[PDB]
Ligand binder design. Sequence first.
Ligand SMILES: Nc1ncnc2c1ncn2[C@@H]1O[C@H](COP(=O)(O)OP(=O)(O)OC[C@H]2O[C@@H](O)[C@H](O)[C@@H]2O)[C@@H](O)[C@H]1O
Length: 171
Amino acid sequence: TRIHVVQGDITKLAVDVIVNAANPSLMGGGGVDGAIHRAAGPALLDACLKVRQQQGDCPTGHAVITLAGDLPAKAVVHTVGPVWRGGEQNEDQLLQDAYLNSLRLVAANSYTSVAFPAISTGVYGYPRAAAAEIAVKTVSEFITRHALPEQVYFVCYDEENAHLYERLLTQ
Ligand SMILES: Nc1ncnc2c1ncn2[C@@H]1O[C@H](COP(=O)(O)OP(=O)(O)OC[C@H]2O[C@@H](O)[C@H](O)[C@@H]2O)[C@@H](O)[C@H]1O
């Protein structure tokens, strides 16, 4: 009842917090990162540069929160998923960290809902089934233990990722 699968563009979803699958520079990129920067407008990049002055780059697994610009969200949490290098560089733990640290920022800032993209499964090349398992398990445990966020949306950009998530949530 608190976890939903949505098919579409994360930049259109009205939620308190949209999560960005960023890179450590925080200055944007070509996937959902680029889509979020484009939808938010230049204010987002300017906010990310301030964050760089405060705390430098965002290392793999870390998360930072900023304003959301023209997005229909109150804030954007930027996190950096691992690059898949075949499983022996601790990618599973780092992906879990990205989800957990993002959820912690949502809760610490008293936000009630959050939307996640499929972190690391695009250009970072994380096997989709394993990544979704990690997202679902991590989120599930967290909301079992915490009242915030109240609602979590797994935003899937294609039918097949939506199906993996829907199948995982019913197990
Ligand atoms: N508008 C969108 N809404 C929701 N999901 C999207 C959208 N656009 C892309 N996606 C999906 O988000 C998932 C993550 O893919 P990427 O955006 O490639 O992110 P990731 O694999 O974590 O790679 C991060 C790298 O890509 C750059 O954009 C970013 O700066 C970083 O260097 C993929 O399933 C992708 O199809």
